[PDB]
């Protein structure tokens, strides 16, 4: 009366790492994902693991890229 | 029948991502046709056109070269040194290739 | 037979709607031409009587805002468990 289920994998902590309107550094991670849920806006790169990081300092803002898509940008202070 | 102009704009979007502003600016745009060849220099972020000069013999090949020297002087009046070339969707050969080599020799490095 | 109706102002709380459905009244809305979605109240037993006379697709001489307006019944919600209506819509012509 044994079973064949019961195995799972370790959880990979994904999602947003910085809020909206927050000040970030020049190498901070903005989003972990599998695929492209959020596209890289201006002043934001894209890693080899589809990670979204910021290139410069400033405030981070989430925008909309057309219909049923969105992006995230970084603007310098002042 | 197939429209050559409407399928041309599709290829312009595939190249407009890598060079416009992200690579360099201002952007030199080329618009070819079966009767005349045009050109103009645009700003990406501001969204304004700086200079403009176009062709309007030999079915627009030497006149395609003529735009290269005319734009280069219009690019030297206001003063710009570094530029980025936008093919516009056409292959870099022939009429459009002659327009680039003309502006390059006239003190306008790409 | 004519729908003698009164008005209700402000935002009616959830309790007063339950108290309205028990005293024998039914809420309604007139959203025709120029009426500006005026919320209106109406009796229950006097609505079933008039629609039997004229019909489901007949006009009504409803009195709202102390004036006569010719309106018809567009759609209404019905609770099947207690065999009675809960809401009426009036599309003025």
């Amino acid at each position: 009366s044994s079973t064949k289920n019961g195995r799972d994998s370790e959880s990979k902590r994904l999602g947003a790492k910085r809020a909206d309107g927050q000040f970030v550094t020049g190498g901070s991670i903005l989003y972990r994902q599998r695929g492209t849920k959020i596209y890289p806006g201006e002043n934001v790169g894209r890693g080899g693991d589809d990670t979204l990081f910021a290139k410069i300092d400033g405030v981070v803002k989430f925008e909309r890229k057309g219909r049923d898509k969105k992006q995230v940008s970084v603007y310098a202070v002042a | 029948k197939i429209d050559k102009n409407k399928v041309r704009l599709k290829r312009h979007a595939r190249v407009r991502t890598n060079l416009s502003g992200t690579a360099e600016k201002p952007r030199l745009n080329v618009y070819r046709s079966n009767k005349h060849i045009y050109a103009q220099i645009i700003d990406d972020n501001k969204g304004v056109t700086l200079a403009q000069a176009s062709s309007k013999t030999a079915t627009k090949v030497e006149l395609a070269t003529k735009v290269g020297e005319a734009i280069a002087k219009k690019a030297a009046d206001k003063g710009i040194k570094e530029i980025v070339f936008d093919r516009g969707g056409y292959l870099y050969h022939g009429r459009v290739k002659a327009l680039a080599e003309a502006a390059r020799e006239s003190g306008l490095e790409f | 037979a004519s729908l003698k109706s009164i008005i209700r102002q402000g935002k009616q709380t959830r309790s007063d709607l339950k108290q309205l459905r028990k005293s024998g009244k039914v809420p309604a809305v007139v959203y025709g031409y120029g009426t500006k979605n005026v919320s209106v109240k109406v009796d229950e037993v006097e609505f079933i009587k008039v629609i039997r006379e004229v019909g489901r697709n007949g006009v009504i001489e409803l009195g709202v805002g102390s004036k006569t307006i010719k309106v018809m019944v567009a759609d209404y919600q019905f609770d099947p468990l207690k065999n009675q209506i809960t809401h009426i819509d009036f599309l003025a012509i």
Partner: protein, 136 residues
């Protein structure tokens, strides 16, 4: 015996059983219907028992419409077993009936004989019923 020919997963979580019915609150196909005023599970075996007892009273009068269907399967472990060591095995197929859903529909008969047919079908089901008609 109503049961789907194939399902994606044989073992599923049991339904909620609490709340109110989504649809099927009015009579659309037939004329005289049968409402429900209590929540319970209607096994497929209880449907064939009520359908035979209903269409028999109407030898060849009219048509009957079954409005529900046993999509969800339930399981039960064998006899004399402790807890755990996996899940059970499929034993039947059930539906979820909430207050307001029409169970059966009858047309092609008179009003006096529709009440007697839908009465014998209500004693076979574990819920309470109410004779309803088409809405004006």
């Amino acid at each position: 015996m109503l049961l789907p020919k194939r399902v994606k997963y044989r073992r599923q979580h049991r339904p909620k059983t609490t709340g109110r019915s989504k649809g099927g609150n009015y009579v659309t196909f037939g004329e005289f219907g049968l409402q429900a005023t209590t929540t319970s599970w209607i096994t497929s075996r209880q449907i064939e028992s009520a359908r035979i007892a209903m269409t028999r009273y109407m030898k060849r009068g009219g048509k009957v419409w079954i409005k529900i269907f046993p999509h969800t399967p339930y399981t039960k472990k064998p006899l004399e077993v402790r807890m755990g060591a996996g899940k059970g095995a499929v034993e039947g197929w059930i539906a979820v009936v909430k207050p307001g859903r029409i169970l059966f529909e009858v047309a092609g008969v008179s009003e006096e004989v529709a009440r007697e047919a839908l009465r014998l079908a209500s004693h076979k089901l574990p819920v309470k019923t109410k004779f309803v008609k088409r809405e004006e």
